[PDB]
C-alpha cells in the first residue's frame, strides 16, 4: 500500500502571461511542485518568498497565480516586459522545494499623457506663444494622438489665452488682448488616443526678451 514519499520539482524555474487591467483578485493558471508517484502532487501547498511589486499572490490549494493589488506596465519594476517572483511549496511529510515564477506583462493602454516641460516663455515683443508638448509612458501604439484643451480651466482664464494644436504631440499656447508683463498658472487638460486623461497646471512667463527665448535680465 502506497505512502506519500518525497517531490521531485522540475523544471526549476516556470513563467506565465498577465495582462495589465486584470482584476483584484482574478487567478489563472500557475507554478506547481512536481510528485511522480501519484503523477500529481495534491497535498502540496504554496507560499511565495521574494516579491519586487506585490501585485499577485499564489493560490495555496493550487499554486495558481491571482491579482491581489493592481498591476503596472509602465513602472520601473519590469524590464523587457517581465518580472519575477520566488516561490516554495510545503509538503506534510515535513519536505519542500523552491523555484521561479517569471510573469511576462502585456501592456494596455491604460496612462495618461504627461507633460515633460511646464515652465515656458513667452516673449511678447516678438512671439505671441509657447509650444506645449507631452508624452505617453505606455507603448508607442498606447500614446498619441493627443487631444489638447483648456478645458479644466476658468472662464476668467480662457479670456486671456488661446490654445491650439500642433502635432500628434503637441500645442501652441497664445496670448490674447494685451495682458501685461509678468507670471500666470494655465491649467491644460490633454487627453491621448483612447482618450486617457491628465490634468497638469502651466508656468507661464510673459516677458521683454534678448534671445528671443528667455527674458532680460
Request: charged share 25%; hydrophobic share 30%.
Amino acid at each position: 500500500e502506497d505512502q506519500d514519499e518525497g517531490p521531485e520539482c522540475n523544471p526549476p524555474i516556470q513563467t506565465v502571461r498577465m495582462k495589465e487591467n486584470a482584476e483584484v483578485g482574478t487567478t489563472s493558471n500557475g507554478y506547481k511542485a512536481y510528485d511522480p508517484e501519484t503523477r500529481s502532487s495534491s497535498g502540496i501547498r504554496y507560499k511565495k518568498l521574494t516579491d519586487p511589486t506585490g501585485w499577485v499572490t499564489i493560490d495555496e490549494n493550487t499554486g495558481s497565480i491571482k491579482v491581489f493589488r493592481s498591476l503596472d506596465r509602465e513602472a520601473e519594476t519590469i524590464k523587457n516586459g517581465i518580472y519575477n517572483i520566488t516561490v516554495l511549496a510545503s509538503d506534510q511529510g515535513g519536505r519542500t522545494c523552491t523555484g521561479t515564477l517569471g510573469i511576462i506583462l502585456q501592456d494596455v493602454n491604460d496612462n495618461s499623457p504627461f507633460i515633460p516641460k511646464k515652465t515656458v516663455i513667452i516673449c511678447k515683443p516678438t512671439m505671441s506663444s509657447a509650444e506645449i508638448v507631452a508624452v505617453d509612458p505606455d507603448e508607442p501604439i498606447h500614446g498619441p494622438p493627443f487631444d489638447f484643451s483648456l478645458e479644466s480651466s476658468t472662464s476668467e482664464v480662457q479670456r486671456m489665452w488661446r490654445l491650439k494644436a500642433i502635432n500628434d504631440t503637441a500645442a501652441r499656447l497664445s496670448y490674447q488682448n494685451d495682458p501685461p508683463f509678468g507670471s500666470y498658472v494655465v491649467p491644460i487638460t490633454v487627453r491621448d488616443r483612447l482618450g486617457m486623461s491628465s490634468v497638469t497646471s502651466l508656468d507661464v512667463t510673459l516677458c521683454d526678451c534678448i534671445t528671443e527665448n528667455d527674458c532680460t535680465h
